[PDB]
Subunit: 173 residues, 6 copies
């Protein structure tokens, strides 16, 4: 993982390593860059499943000390541990008991997934799905004692790119 | 459906027709007794899945006008539309925007499922699972506008049997 | 099957009994109304899978002697043998070695599937999917000796409703 | 179930109602002809799965009091509760604690499944699979206390047809 | 694989790399530490599936020349090739045609899987499952000519830890 | 990937790294040898699935600049990213808009998969399957604008081995 480039053309053309496929059984994996393996992190107490694929941009460091994380919408779930070339639609702003958290929302490169080319920004994402994603983050850790998540709202591509820009910078010191 | 007996020996030995398997994709089916078919009722807005199998006791009529409904815990999900001989462990008491709702909690007959014979009452059901079920009912209809569910708590086998007793009585007028 | 109503309000509000779920393994089932069971019709030589759910309107008789058939787009595949309340978006016009064939394109009632409410007519169906459906019909029977299918194009809701109207009429003699 | 014909042309052209798909999770279902539903019979103690589809010929009565049962080899598992038009390859002779048991081995009609047309008799069935089936019957009930199964060997199409012939006769009194 | 630590705190807190998920299709994989890939070892003649997840402790060498192997009980199967932080419940003692074989029985760290925290020792593992595991090992290689497995019985956490202790020692020469 | 040997005994005994399992959802992955990861290449416009497992021989370079690719027939799909020891049955000759393309057809080593040992050459592969594979290649890229594939026919083990021989040579310069 630690040698996969952050992107062909940052911040708009970036790579995402998938950790949790959309609709997978409710087990959270986290990539160990140090090992090149997915690690079983948690069996989700609520047993709720990610509504979209979940992963990270390698060679990034967000303020929380982990890589920039990303939700990638696709017509079929992606393989855990695989890498996909992606583009941003925006971000979901949240705060939990430890501080700010933001998850980017992305889709594959148009050449990879023509099915998603019509999605130009976060607002093109179907209402039911944005609502579903918001609900997921608000509730999935409900049975993890000591934890809480509050969703603040959505932001656009600019904000997503800033997040990418900074994470790439921080990672290099 | 309308000719399947409520039970071999009511209220302790009863039958459950399965409508929604544990962990099935988030689509709610409802049996049409008049037709002998499962009907697509709703695509669940939250996309949350039933943590246990869900069905009903045929030839019962609860106060809400539908048959007595039941959660049936099994080691592998049951086939939608199949029937299972069951025994009660208790009930989950709830109220929603339309009034009282109670869902029985059951397991298969010991001869059918030896794996569940150790469960004698609701208290033997693992904490994580009862918590998971409570959370599911509190949140699954969160994105159905106009709807709400509040979970009151659990009750034992006596209460479950009363519910069966009355539903069987009401159904016969 | 033979007692399930064609629809609550024909031709715009109709019922579809599902025979083949979207993306199911490549085995064609056909409902036997006389028996109330799905019959294994054919293992598809090309092994191609239906890109959308496939079924029929009960109590209809199309000119080809079978019920009016329908493709039903949903976010998760529907259960074979289940029934869904649907509305039409249009039709796919085709001809095969035996004559005209038309398949309606439908989605569930808005109350059943909010995810599809945005689809008002055939033109709202994503390009990639219409193309995918056209390709499927043109090729799926490619390895059935003696058979061929040619796709003529799409038509709108009016045409779909006429097809429903006539099939309902014919079925009653 | 009780109205599905035993066959279009007995004993060589017969119908099989599927109860347990090949490779399904290890739950035994049994069709209730009286109800027209599949009943959960047993969660298999060994958790072993049927290596081929398992069902019965309707309107037959074998000496053991149940319908003639049949293993149906197909390239993809069949839907539980569906019906398939079949032809026999032979039988597996067995005895258990209750007496003789014989399971026919069948494949779909050549027009249904071209993939199986090459199988003319039991000897054309791959060695590994016959061995696998024999092992399954010898071991699957190993953890059902009081039960045992001994496999005697295989027999051909004649024997299979006799079994069909008699079961059809007995069923009619 | 060869750089994943044996454990955070040996022998009680160790790591397991998963090779075969619970209930996966009957194909045996073996991790190639030299390559960092899972290798297709065998299609199991009996077609029996592992009842629990199966893997190994990296950087261990058992007396048989392979790493210490482990069965890891979880509520949903784990991803092949993933790593899980685990704790031992005991061991299953066996002998096959090549000599002693022992498989540890483990569960994830309590923080990873709260669902398993109630299991303190091998005796807390449900009877049906221990029986199922014993049966699996006794029979799964039944159709591998030249091979046999005899199960001797179970042992506790002490024995499991000794096995870990020695394998870690041997691996380092 | 780049360190996995081409084979134990080239050209007849070789290794195949699997990229796309038989019957997987229609997403094309390509191994990045430089990274040791599978990359999402394309969501297949036709949504057609590989009828057999698809992968490549590592440390080979075909004339088209990519490694020698191989279809591997197995009784259950193989894990993406896994490696299997294989033997050739022949090849499928094709041309597309960019030039010659040939895909080898292989099965696992007899010791790995006894189920396939009966297949000695391409002609032993069932007709329906060869036809299915030919159809797949002729049609799967039908909705990739600018692309086309024409299937020329099949060739035997000699031709397959030549392809292996040359790819191994080219890779080493
Ligand atoms: C949540 C996550 C993924 C999907 N996938 C459906 C989809 C995506 C893109 C284009 N066409 C169809 C749906 C909901
Ligand atoms: C929710 C619903 C069903 C299960 N099934 C697991 C189970 C049930 C009974 C006995 N042994 C294992 C688990 C959670
Ligand atoms: C719901 C009901 C019972 C259980 N039983 C716990 C359990 C542990 C290990 C194996 N199998 C089962 C779990 C969920
Ligand atoms: C073909 C058939 C069904 C789908 N389902 C995806 C879908 C449908 C409706 C609304 N949102 C997402 C996609 C392609
Ligand atoms: C068929 C019909 C509608 C769609 N809707 C596109 C879509 C994008 C993202 C999430 N969900 C759905 C896709 C296929
Ligand atoms: C056991 C049961 C079914 C199968 N199906 C594979 C198969 C069957 C017929 C023709 N071609 C391939 C294999 C083993
Ligand atoms: C049961 C019956 C027939 C077969 N047929 C063998 C086979 C080889 C390659 C592809 N498809 C089928 C296998 C199992
Ligand atoms: C065999 C292997 C795993 C399971 N998983 C069920 C389970 C495990 C732990 C806690 N709750 C439920 C069951 C049997
Ligand atoms: C296409 C690809 C794989 C299969 N697998 C079935 C099979 C293979 C070998 C031996 N026995 C049965 C069938 C068609």
């Amino acid at each position: 993982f630690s040698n996969v480039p952050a992107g062909k053309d940052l911040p708009q053309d970036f790579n995402v390593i998938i950790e949790i496929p959309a609709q997978s059984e409710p087990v959270k994996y986290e990539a160990d860059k140090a090992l090149g393996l997915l690690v079983v992190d948690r069996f989700i107490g609520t047993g709720m499943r990610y509504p979209v694929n979940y992963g990270f941009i390698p060679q990034t460091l967000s303020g929380d000390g982990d890589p920039v994380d990303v939700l990638v919408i696709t017509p079929f779930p992606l393989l855990a541990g695989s890498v996909v070339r992606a583009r941003a639609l925006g971000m979901l702003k949240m705060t939990d008991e430890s501080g700010v958290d933001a998850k980017l929302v992305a889709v594959p490169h148009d050449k990879v997934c023509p099915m998603t080319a019509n999605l130009k920004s976060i607002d093109d994402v179907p209402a039911y799905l944005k609502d579903q994603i918001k609900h997921f983050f608000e509730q999935y850790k409900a049975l993890e004692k000591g934890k809480w998540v509050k969703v603040e709202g959505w932001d656009g591509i600019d904000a997503a790119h800033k997040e990418i820009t900074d994470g790439v910078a921080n990672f290099k010191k």
